[PDB]
Amino acid sequence: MREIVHIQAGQCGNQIGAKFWEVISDEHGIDPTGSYHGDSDLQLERINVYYNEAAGNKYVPRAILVDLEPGTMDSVRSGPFGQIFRPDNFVFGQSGAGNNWAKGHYTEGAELVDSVLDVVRKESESCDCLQGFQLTHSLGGGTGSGMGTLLISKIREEYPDRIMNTFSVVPSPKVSDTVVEPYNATLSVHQLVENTDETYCIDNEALYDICFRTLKLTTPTYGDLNHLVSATMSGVTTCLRFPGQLNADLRKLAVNMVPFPRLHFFMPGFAPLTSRGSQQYRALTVPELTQQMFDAKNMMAACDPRHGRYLTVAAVFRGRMSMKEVDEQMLNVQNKNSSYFVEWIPNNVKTAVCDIPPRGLKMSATFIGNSTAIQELFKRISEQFTAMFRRKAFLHWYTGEGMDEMEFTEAESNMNDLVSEYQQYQDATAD
Amino acid sequence: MREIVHIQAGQCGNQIGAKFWEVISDEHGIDPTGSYHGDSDLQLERINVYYNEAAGNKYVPRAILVDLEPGTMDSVRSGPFGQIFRPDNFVFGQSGAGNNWAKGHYTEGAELVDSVLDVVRKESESCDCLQGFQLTHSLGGGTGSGMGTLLISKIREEYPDRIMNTFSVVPSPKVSDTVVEPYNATLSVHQLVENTDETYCIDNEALYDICFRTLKLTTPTYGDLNHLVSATMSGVTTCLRFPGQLNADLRKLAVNMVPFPRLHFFMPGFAPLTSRGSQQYRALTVPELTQQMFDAKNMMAACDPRHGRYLTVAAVFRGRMSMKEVDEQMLNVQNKNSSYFVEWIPNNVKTAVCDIPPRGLKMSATFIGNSTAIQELFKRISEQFTAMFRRKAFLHWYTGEGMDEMEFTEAESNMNDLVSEYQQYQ
Amino acid sequence: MREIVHIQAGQCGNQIGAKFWEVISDEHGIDPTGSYHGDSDLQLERINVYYNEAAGNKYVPRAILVDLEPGTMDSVRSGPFGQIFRPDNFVFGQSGAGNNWAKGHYTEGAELVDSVLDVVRKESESCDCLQGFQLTHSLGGGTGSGMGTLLISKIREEYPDRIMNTFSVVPSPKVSDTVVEPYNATLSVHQLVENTDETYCIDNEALYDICFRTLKLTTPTYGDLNHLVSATMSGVTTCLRFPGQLNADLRKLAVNMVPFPRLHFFMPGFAPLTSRGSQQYRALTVPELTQQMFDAKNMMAACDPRHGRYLTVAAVFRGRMSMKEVDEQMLNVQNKNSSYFVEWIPNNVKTAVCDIPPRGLKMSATFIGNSTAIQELFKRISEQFTAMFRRKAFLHWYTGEGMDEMEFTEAESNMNDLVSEYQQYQDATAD
Amino acid sequence: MREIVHIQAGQCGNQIGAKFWEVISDEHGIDPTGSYHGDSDLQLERINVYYNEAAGNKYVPRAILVDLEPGTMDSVRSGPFGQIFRPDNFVFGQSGAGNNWAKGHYTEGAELVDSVLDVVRKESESCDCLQGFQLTHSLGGGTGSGMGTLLISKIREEYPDRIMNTFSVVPSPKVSDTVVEPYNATLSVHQLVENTDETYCIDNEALYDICFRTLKLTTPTYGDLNHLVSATMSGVTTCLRFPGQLNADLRKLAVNMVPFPRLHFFMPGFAPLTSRGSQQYRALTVPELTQQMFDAKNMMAACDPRHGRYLTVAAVFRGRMSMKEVDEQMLNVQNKNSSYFVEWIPNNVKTAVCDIPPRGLKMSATFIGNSTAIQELFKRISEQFTAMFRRKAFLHWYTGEGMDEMEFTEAESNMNDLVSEYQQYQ
Ligand SMILES: Nc1nc2c(ncn2[C@@H]2O[C@H](COP(=O)(O)OP(=O)(O)O)[C@@H](O)[C@H]2O)c(=O)[nH]1
Ligand SMILES: Nc1nc2c(ncn2[C@@H]2O[C@H](COP(=O)(O)OP(=O)(O)O)[C@@H](O)[C@H]2O)c(=O)[nH]1
Ligand SMILES: Nc1nc2c(ncn2[C@@H]2O[C@H](COP(=O)(O)OP(=O)(O)O)[C@@H](O)[C@H]2O)c(=O)[nH]1
Ligand SMILES: Nc1nc2c(ncn2[C@@H]2O[C@H](COP(=O)(O)OP(=O)(O)O)[C@@H](O)[C@H]2O)c(=O)[nH]1
Numbered sequence A, C: 001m002r003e004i005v006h007i008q009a010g011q012c013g014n015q016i017g018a019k020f021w022e023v024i025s026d027e028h029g030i031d032p033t034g035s036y037h038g039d040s041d042l043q044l045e046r047i048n049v050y051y052n053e054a055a056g057n058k059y060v061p062r063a064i065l066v067d068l069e070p071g072t073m074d075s076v077r078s079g080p081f082g083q084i085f086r087p088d089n090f091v092f093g094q095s096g097a098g099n100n101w102a103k104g105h106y107t108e109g110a111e112l113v114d115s116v117l118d119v120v121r122k123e124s125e126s127c128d129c130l131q132g133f134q135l136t137h138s139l140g141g142g143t144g145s146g147m148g149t150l151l152i153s154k155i156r157e158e159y160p161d162r163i164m165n166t167f168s169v170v171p172s173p174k175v176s177d178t179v180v181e182p183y184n185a186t187l188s189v190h191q192l193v194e195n196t197d198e199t200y201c202i203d204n205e206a207l208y209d210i211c212f213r214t215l216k217l218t219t220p221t222y223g224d225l226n227h228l229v230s231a232t233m234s235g236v237t238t239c240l241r242f243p244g245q246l247n248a249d250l251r252k253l254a255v256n257m258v259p260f261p262r263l264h265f266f267m268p269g270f271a272p273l274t275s276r277g278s279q280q281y282r283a284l285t286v287p288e289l290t291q292q293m294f295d296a297k298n299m300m301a302a303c304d305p306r307h308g309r310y311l312t313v314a315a316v317f318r319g320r321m322s323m324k325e326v327d328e329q330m331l332n333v334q335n336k337n338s339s340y341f342v343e344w345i346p347n348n349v350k351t352a353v354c355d356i357p358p359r360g361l362k363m364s365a366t367f368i369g370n371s372t373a374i375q376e377l378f379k380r381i382s383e384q385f386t387a388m389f390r391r392k393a394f395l396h397w398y399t400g401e402g403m404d405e406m407e408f409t410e411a412e413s414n415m416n417d418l419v420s421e422y423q424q425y426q427d428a429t430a431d
Numbered sequence B, D: 001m002r003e004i005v006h007i008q009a010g011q012c013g014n015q016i017g018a019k020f021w022e023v024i025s026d027e028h029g030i031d032p033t034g035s036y037h038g039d040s041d042l043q044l045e046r047i048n049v050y051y052n053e054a055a056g057n058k059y060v061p062r063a064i065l066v067d068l069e070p071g072t073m074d075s076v077r078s079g080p081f082g083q084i085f086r087p088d089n090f091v092f093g094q095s096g097a098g099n100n101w102a103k104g105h106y107t108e109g110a111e112l113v114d115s116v117l118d119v120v121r122k123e124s125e126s127c128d129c130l131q132g133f134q135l136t137h138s139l140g141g142g143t144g145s146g147m148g149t150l151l152i153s154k155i156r157e158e159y160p161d162r163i164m165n166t167f168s169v170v171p172s173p174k175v176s177d178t179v180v181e182p183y184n185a186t187l188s189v190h191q192l193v194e195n196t197d198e199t200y201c202i203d204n205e206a207l208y209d210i211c212f213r214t215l216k217l218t219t220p221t222y223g224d225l226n227h228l229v230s231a232t233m234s235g236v237t238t239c240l241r242f243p244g245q246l247n248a249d250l251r252k253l254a255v256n257m258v259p260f261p262r263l264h265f266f267m268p269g270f271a272p273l274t275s276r277g278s279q280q281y282r283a284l285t286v287p288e289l290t291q292q293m294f295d296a297k298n299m300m301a302a303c304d305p306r307h308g309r310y311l312t313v314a315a316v317f318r319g320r321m322s323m324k325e326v327d328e329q330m331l332n333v334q335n336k337n338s339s340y341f342v343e344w345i346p347n348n349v350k351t352a353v354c355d356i357p358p359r360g361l362k363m364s365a366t367f368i369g370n371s372t373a374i375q376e377l378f379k380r381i382s383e384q385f386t387a388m389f390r391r392k393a394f395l396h397w398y399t400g401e402g403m404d405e406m407e408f409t410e411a412e413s414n415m416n417d418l419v420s421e422y423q424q425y426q
Helices: A010-027 A070-078 A101-106 A108-125 A143-158 A181-192 A204-213 A222-236 A250-257 A286-293 A323-336 A374-390 A405-425 B011-027 B041-045 B070-078 B101-125 B143-158 B181-195 B204-214 B222-236 B250-257 B286-293 B323-336 B372-389 B405-424 C010-027 C070-078 C101-106 C108-125 C143-158 C181-192 C204-213 C222-236 C250-257 C286-293 C323-336 C374-390 C405-425 D011-027 D041-045 D070-078 D101-125 D143-158 D181-195 D204-214 D222-236 D250-257 D286-293 D323-336 D372-389 D405-424
Strands: A002-009 A051-053 A059-061 A063-067 A090-092 A129-138 A163-170 A198-203 A265-271 A310-318 A349-354 A364-371 B003-009 B051-054 B058-061 B063-067 B090-092 B130-138 B163-169 B198-202 B265-271 B310-318 B349-354 B364-371 C002-009 C051-053 C059-061 C063-067 C090-092 C129-138 C163-170 C198-203 C265-271 C310-318 C349-354 C364-371 D003-009 D051-054 D058-061 D063-067 D090-092 D130-138 D163-169 D198-202 D265-271 D310-318 D349-354 D364-371
Touching: A002 A010, A002 A108, A002 A143, A010 A059, A010 A063, A010 A070, A010 A129, A010 A143, A010 A163, A010 A222, A063 A070, A063 A108, A063 A143, A070 A090, A090 A108, A101 A108, A101 A143, A101 A181, A108 A143, A129 A143, A129 A250, A143 A163, A143 A181, A163 A181, A163 A222, A163 A250, A181 A374, A181 A405, A198 A204, A198 A222, A198 A250, A198 A374, A204 A222, A204 B323, A222 A265, A222 A310, A222 A364, A250 A310, A250 A349, A250 A364, A265 A286, A286 A310, A286 A323, A286 A364, A310 A323, A323 A349, A374 A405, B003 B011, B003 B101, B003 B143, B011 B058, B011 B063, B011 B070, B011 B130, B011 B143, B011 B163, B011 B222, B063 B070, B063 B101, B063 B143, B070 B090, B090 B101, B101 B143, B101 B181, B130 B143, B130 B250, B143 B163, B143 B181, B163 B181, B163 B222, B163 B250, B181 B372, B181 B405, B198 B204, B198 B222, B198 B250, B204 B222, B222 B265, B222 B310, B222 B364, B250 B310, B250 B364, B265 B286, B265 B372, B286 B310, B286 B323, B286 B364, B310 B323, B323 B349, B364 B372, B372 B405, C002 C010, C002 C108, C002 C143, C010 C059, C010 C063, C010 C070, C010 C129, C010 C143, C010 C163, C010 C222, C063 C070, C063 C108, C063 C143, C070 C090, C090 C108, C101 C108, C101 C143, C101 C181, C108 C143, C129 C143, C129 C250, C143 C163, C143 C181, C163 C181, C163 C222, C163 C250, C181 C374, C181 C405, C198 C204, C198 C222, C198 C250, C198 C374, C204 C222, C204 D323, C222 C265, C222 C310, C222 C364, C250 C310, C250 C349, C250 C364, C265 C286, C286 C310, C286 C323, C286 C364, C310 C323, C323 C349, C374 C405, D003 D011, D003 D101, D003 D143, D011 D058, D011 D063, D011 D070, D011 D130, D011 D143, D011 D163, D011 D222, D063 D070, D063 D101, D063 D143, D070 D090, D090 D101, D101 D143, D101 D181, D130 D143, D130 D250, D143 D163, D143 D181, D163 D181, D163 D222, D163 D250, D181 D372, D181 D405, D198 D204, D198 D222, D198 D250, D204 D222, D222 D265, D222 D310, D222 D364, D250 D310, D250 D364, D265 D286, D265 D372, D286 D310, D286 D323, D286 D364, D310 D323, D323 D349, D364 D372, D372 D405
Parallel strands: A002 A063, A002 A129, A063 A090, A129 A163, A163 A198, A198 A265, A310 A349, B003 B063, B003 B130, B063 B090, B130 B163, B163 B198, B198 B265, B310 B349, C002 C063, C002 C129, C063 C090, C129 C163, C163 C198, C198 C265, C310 C349, D003 D063, D003 D130, D063 D090, D130 D163, D163 D198, D198 D265, D310 D349
Antiparallel strands: A051 A059, A265 A364, A310 A364, B051 B058, B265 B364, B310 B364, C051 C059, C265 C364, C310 C364, D051 D058, D265 D364, D310 D364
């Protein structure tokens, strides 16, 4: 019924989406060949949310892979679960963006966007009732940032009422993996704040902090980070696929989480997360899930939520639970820690409970927080962008692709307006 | 997907290119006869980046050999891996350069550049998507400097949007191997600063220092210096050939590394480098690679980076690693040694991680630093150029080949303007 | 219901706490793997006093281990019962205090106290009804003294009405194991007298005297001393865990034992204690327990109670007993030896009787005496501190950590005030 | 957790350090090749205190060798356990010290200290938590005295809060091995009393007395004196490596032992020491260890402690023991011999008990005494220094290297002030 078109863009985003499809196919009992070998009847009851049936009991993921270089495409094709994707959906150029937003947004992505949109339209025509779109990409890259923003603009133009969800990997506060990361991030945010319904802020540095501090991993690979991001992704759209005591689709989350049209950048989280050894010392109760969810050191975005206030909070639980216990924990958190929630919104937390827990767990819960502490991320990116743009650092690389400097000025102005709005709404007396 | 055309010009350029192709053929399992005898599918998955497939299960390096004298080409053709190149790509004249930039750029190189460009265009037509070119040459000689700068100008005119990379051997601060090195070096920089995308500064003085202090080599010949240079060359383009956790090809490296169009002169480095005796006493960890990379005594350019400040830094790692450990080491380096980085650029270091280590190593990492300390090289070259030009020393050898004093004055002015810019951003 | 948070600090204190948890797990039938393999139903009826259940019938001790050096932590992890502790509760630095109170209290312990308090808050949130806290440490050391006093101050600030009990190892009268023991002891007492509800004075020298004189041990190890201290610890909180004819929790003992807010330093004791051979010559009757309890040579604090008067006395018995016999013995002791009890307090002895004796015994009894003879300990420590401070002996080691000399003066003044108070209340005519 | 960097400077320092590393490698089961062949998990549980793990199941001692002459280093490298050190840590010059403090401190040591400090910082960066440094050197020579004092000053400036321990061989009261021992000794104490945390006074005279009277050795070479010194060195830091009933690391030892910042010169001792013949006639009990420890004829410093009074006393025991027996013996010693302890410090002796005895022994104990009787050493050194300086004997050899008479006067004044303090507290 309610179907989601997943779009992969860039190395940082498509590389996640591969792990995401691994996890999703594991949840629904679909082996790396597309054949169904599950046990529970509920696995195929809502299988069409992500999977088209391919006339012979093979299920094909409704996914579209976009990049400007075929290397990541070959890597995805050769790896595990690379044989379930439809070969027609691997749309890729030959040049590559080179971490240049202007390039990937105006020349190479502009040449490839027509084929990408043809594939998107073909996937949307095959649907029963299109719920929305799902994009995975990074903000500080090339293909990812520019190509994803271009695709979001195009699709928002074509489908104005569908849901546009993006899981964006944001720049890290300490270590940057791209020398021009501020420009790409600022331009990508300027494009995102105008077209997306909700966007999730994944920060790699926070993911390494979680892997070392909580999971006690000494050698964490990108498999683990992509697995955490994919667990978040699966927890988001769980209510669309399995029944539960309280259902909450993407639109319900968007309504309950976005108070004003521009404040839609969320801090995702996940629980439970334990090391391999500490499993035998932790009982799994709803209070434990609640304690780990509302934890600053558990956020996947490198922004301390204790430095701001929560506008809205989504808490999607999974597994057999008591509604009284979940409601009790939410209310106790709101009452005991009232100094961290926005005053002019009563009942800040949205609650959803599903019946089917993730693979191997008795129960879990996905945290989605809309906190004003994301102004830290935005202000840091704005200050770095100003420091680099004042000297025109590497500005010629973007002006040589036909991009205007006034466009950079407008993007900086929009970023600062978003920062000022986030600051305006926190610490605003409800009187 | 992406393909590279390699052009090697000069005696030094041909030697470094022969060693480079030996190393590259070893990485992809291509024996000296062109046959493939590897053991991993990744070796053939992206082999077309450097190799054209001549039907018959044989691969031919997409390399073009340029020289004004046939001796170096004969030595290259007769040696090991000399039978792997295409015989049509040995484009050489008969006159010789004579370590004269004027000669090699206006008379002999001008007579040979038409055939060289014919070969270049033929090689370019056989690609699916041309990524860019690489020029291996030295700035001290006649064929290298003049011929390579002429070829760079011609190709930049023909291909204005492709990546132009050059691996230039720069004059040494202690002992020159050519009496007229300042003239050739200045006249070559006058073209390189205008036509190239990124230039890697390699100095034989720093290579001898590495081979002696670090590798503990009693008798290092050029077979080892060229091997170090080839290790750098292979580490630069490892993201175009093998998969990894975080990719960064030539275009993205040039984007992250060059803040302003004229400041594109880099200091390459490599780690790990250990002697055979000290090999059993050193644990190979990512912090060790990070410590050896950002080391002044490990730079392949004879310029102390501690006398300047880093604009941008590239750190391409190879082998199974953790993203978190690499990022933590980069952040520790940026924080603890913040006084050597320009304050107007946050997060100077841009990293990349490949999943395939070099042959025989568990892991390694190539350092590419764009430091303002490179202004010392240009200041020394400009001082020597002025000292020689104020007395017209060896000047008739260049004015008798078609040049004039106005061109030398313009080259000196461009060199000094580059110096002034590098000092301005420090 | 009533739960206790045990906190281990320092080598001298954590080293006890290991033996304490061995004994407690033996009493409740919990093997070194956390599994329950007891016999009596009463062992699990009040198991939550010390143990959190870990979702699978494994019980985890509600203990927190604190030190400034990981050596003792590794020793505890590797030894027996080291696998029942939760790995998240091993909070340790890297430097070490070096028997410097100023260091461990102001720099290293100050750096570690935030993590320690986070663990403490997490343990307190999981409780049903927090009764109080329990600290085991030494006064003449580094991590022990300074770190424990800092933790006591922090927790007293956060939880002002909970019970703060500390089992402190005090300096010995003859042999000192630390050259700077007077300074650490004086500063630790200055901090303790202001925040703790009751503190027990364990002296090693008295423990060797008991081991040689009474137990007839020729080669007593710290296993035996820690075992005696742990037997005392278990006898203190027995009424909170097993039923009895007279129940007396920690708060009842604190009320009946501390007449004035500053006089809360107790002299613990234990009975019966016999050698291996003399067991066949001693009948175990309540009069025998009473005779051994009120014995100066049986005190675990190296202070002769015959040199002072008893303000209050606690006598917690264990095992099947006649109430008439216990009351008769208490009354006979008060009447025949009236010259050793404070005149202005009638009925100096508090009586508590539990039904379950310790492991292997038919019955026992724990002595807790609040005698004015502890002024001997305090006056000796004050005189040694004065003798060392007059010459500024090793004072630079503490002033180099940012500590003020006026703070030493204040600590000495408070110590002397405590001595003067103890002397004021004894030999004070009740007329 | 805690880690130590060992620095050995001079011929005497290098010999003692080689023997020390032999003993330490024997304790942790590390064979001369670096491979681990122990039989107890406790050997590897805290092996990182002295050993860096070079990946490959090999351990490398965290030791730095310093000398101004390559002969001693060649002898160390060629001998047994010479292959266990890292080859990069042999930092040596070519000139030689010549038993001249001025030379080794201002010219040759000054030329070498930059490389030595580079190695020191490299070793320090590889630790989790640096506990402190140990310097093994002699006060009579040129490399030892001058180079070690220079290194101590440099490191104290770089690391102001780490534990600086030195194991100094002091001049003998009967026969000097260098004609200018007073000058070097005074100029070295002038730095040691200012920059170190604790200094252990070892005298070869007392070591010969021990080897003859106690061990009944007819022909004791330095292979035995260095073994005694190494036994002391290993007993000092045994609480950092093996668990025990009562721990006391370097920081707590320095806290308990040094009452005033300048009185940090200790008299090390060791027990049990028995000949092979008398071994079958002596029962090994804790009272026997206590009796042999507090014995004037057992002190490794040639100063009779019965002529002074003890400020503080450290007694680190090793092996399975009873806390009560050790405490009773300490109390008996303090009570029966109360006239040798300062009355203004109660409970002078601070003890520590480790659960692992030395190799081959059931139990042992290391004595560390801070006695005011050490003023005899400084009085003798000051008398000899004054007698030589009043006539400018051998003075030109030090003034021709950059020193002046003002510096000698200041060193003499500092020595005499230390003497005056030690007498003041007696
Ligand atoms: N979490 C995660 N982040 C990644 C991964 N690969 C790359 N990144 C991040 O993405 C950024 C690089 O952008 P990238 O997407 O590779 O450039 P693009 O391909 O041109 O869009 C860096 O900051 C990396 O930290 C991955 O597999 N997982
Ligand atoms: N790294 C390296 N440098 C070389 C080699 N051969 C020559 N050079 C350097 O290049 C300079 C000589 O220029 P060269 O290229 O031989 O003159 P050309 O033939 O006219 O280009 C000298 O300064 C040499 O130090 C080589 O094989 N490797
Ligand atoms: N009863 C007992 N006392 C101990 C034990 N270990 C150390 N002590 C005493 O504690 C004092 C040393 O203080 P310590 O706690 O080790 O120093 P810290 O670790 O810095 O706090 C000495 O007086 C010892 O007698 C033990 O296991 N049992
Ligand atoms: N214990 C010990 N003392 C030594 C050894 N070698 C030399 N000494 C003493 O050290 C003094 C010589 O100083 P030395 O260190 O050799 O001079 P340096 O090389 O300039 O530091 C003499 O008084 C010797 O008695 C040794 O192996 N062990």
